[PDB]
Structure formats: structure tokens, C-alpha cells
Design a protein around this ligand. Structure first.
Ligand SMILES: Nc1ncnc2c1ncn2[C@@H]1O[C@H](COP(=O)(O)O)[C@@H](O)[C@H]1O
Ligand SMILES: [Zn+2]
Length: 202
């Protein structure tokens, strides 16, 4: 794998999306001593509170190695977060920014600020990987899928979703996602146009 990859996770509630982040991605990052920042929008105790230092200021995001951000509010937040995260990776080296409700920052039809643009196109220069998760394929700007290194998808047969997957990801991906069993997930490697059907994690 690669710490500075953009990984997009797509699946409904209880599909196994969060489980994959909590019991695969997070433990493997830790084990390899890859630092991470969790931009957490779910609530006392954030969904990801157990997995890092619960930051209460921008300075905490820069200075703590494993950090959880409670994102429950100004509209320039991502720009602030992004700035803080860049300073974080200068200190800790390559860092994964984990965003569990990615449609907050990368929603379909939203304007693209320079920060969002850097996040999608220059993330390796910035020393920052991304793990973005969303409920439906069509929640995010199509551009996110074009810029992804890896796209992970759980079962769906929703026709709008299949059309988006064919159009912006892979028509072959759109074929295989229809037959995924519970907790199984398709991995599409954007760079090698490779598909792998992965079994449920242990
Ligand atoms: N091996 C497994 N892979 C994925 N999900 C599992 C597994 N075993 C149990 N689950 C259940 O699936 C939930 C994950 O759903 P989600 O909120 O989409 O992550 C967990 O909280 C468990 O209740
Ligand atoms: Zn956020």
C-alpha cells in the first residue's frame, strides 16, 4: 500500500465501511507507525474518540501524533484543517487524513476551493494521504473518483449508483459490485485499472 494514497470508501450504513476503517486501516497505520488525523463528524464521545487524542484546538492537530478532530461547526473549516494537517505532516512525516462524512467537504456540485483542489491533486506533495468515506457514490464530486488511487465499494444495485460507477470509475466495477455478499467489498485500483473482490475482514 501507500500512505499518501487517496482511498475512497463507498457503502451504506452497516455495510461494513466504518468497520473496515476501525479494524483494518487504523490498526495497519498504527502498526507501521503512520500518523493519522481523523476528521470526525459523528457523536458524549466522537465515533472515533478511542483511536487518538481528542484535539480541542488547531495546535493539537499539529502537535499530537494520532489525533481526532470533532468537526461540529465557520465555513472555512476545511481550509483551516488542511493548513493544520500540512503542518502536522511536516512534523510527523506522511500522515493519513481520515474523513468519515466526506460529502461535508467534497459534495457533488460544490465549488472547488484551492484547499480542496490541493487535497485531491497535490496530496503527495503535501505529505497527506486521504481516506474518504460516503454512503452513496453520487454524494461526492465525480472528480474525487477520478483522482482516487483506490476505490472501495460495498454491495449496491441502485441504478443511479451503477451509472455513476460505470461513468466515473469502471463499467466492469459496476458489474461486480452488484453481486457482493455481506461485508464483501470490491477494490478498484484506479492507476492499474485493476479489480479485486475482497472477503470480509477478520
Ligand atoms: N467481519 C466483519 N466485517 C464487517 N462488519 C462486521 C464484521 N463482523 C461484524 N460486523 C458488523 O458490521 C458492523 C459494521 O458496519 P458499518 O457501520 O458499516 O461499519 C459492525 O459494527 C458489526 O456489527
Ligand atoms: Zn470535517
Amino acid at each position: 500500500m501507500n500512505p499518501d494514497d487517496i482511498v475512497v470508501l463507498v457503502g451504506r450504513k452497516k455495510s461494513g465501511k466504518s468497520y473496515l476503517i476501525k479494524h483494518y486501516f487504523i490498526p495497519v497505520l498504527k502498526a507501521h507507525k503512520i500518523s493519522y488525523i481523523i476528521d470526525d463528524h459523528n457523536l458524549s464521545g466522537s465515533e472515533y474518540s478511542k483511536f487518538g487524542y481528542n484535539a480541542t484546538s488547531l495546535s493539537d492537530i499539529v502537535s499530537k501524533q494520532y489525533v481526532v478532530v470533532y468537526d461540529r461547526a465557520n465555513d472555512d473549516f476545511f481550509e483551516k484543517l488542511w493548513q493544520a494537517s500540512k503542518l502536522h505532516s511536516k512534523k510527523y512525516g506522511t500522515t493519513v487524513l481520515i474523513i468519515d462524512e466526506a460529502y461535508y467537504h467534497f459534495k457533488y456540485k460544490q465549488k472547488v476551493t484551492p484547499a480542496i483542489d490541493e487535497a485531491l491533486h497535490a496530496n503527495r506533495h503535501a505529505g497527506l494521504g486521504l481516506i474518504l468515506s460516503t454512503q452513496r457514490v453520487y454524494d461526492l464530486m465525480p472528480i474525487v473518483y477520478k483522482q482516487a488511487d483506490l476505490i472501495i465499494m460495498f454491495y449496491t444495485r441502485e441504478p443511479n449508483e451503477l451509472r455513476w460507477i460505470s461513468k466515473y470509475i469502471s463499467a466492469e466495477a459496476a458489474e461486480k459490485v452488484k453481486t457482493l455478499k455481506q461485508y464483501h467489498f470490491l477494490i478498484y485500483d484506479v492507476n492499474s485499472q485493476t479489480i479485486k473482490i475482497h472477503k470480509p475482514i477478520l
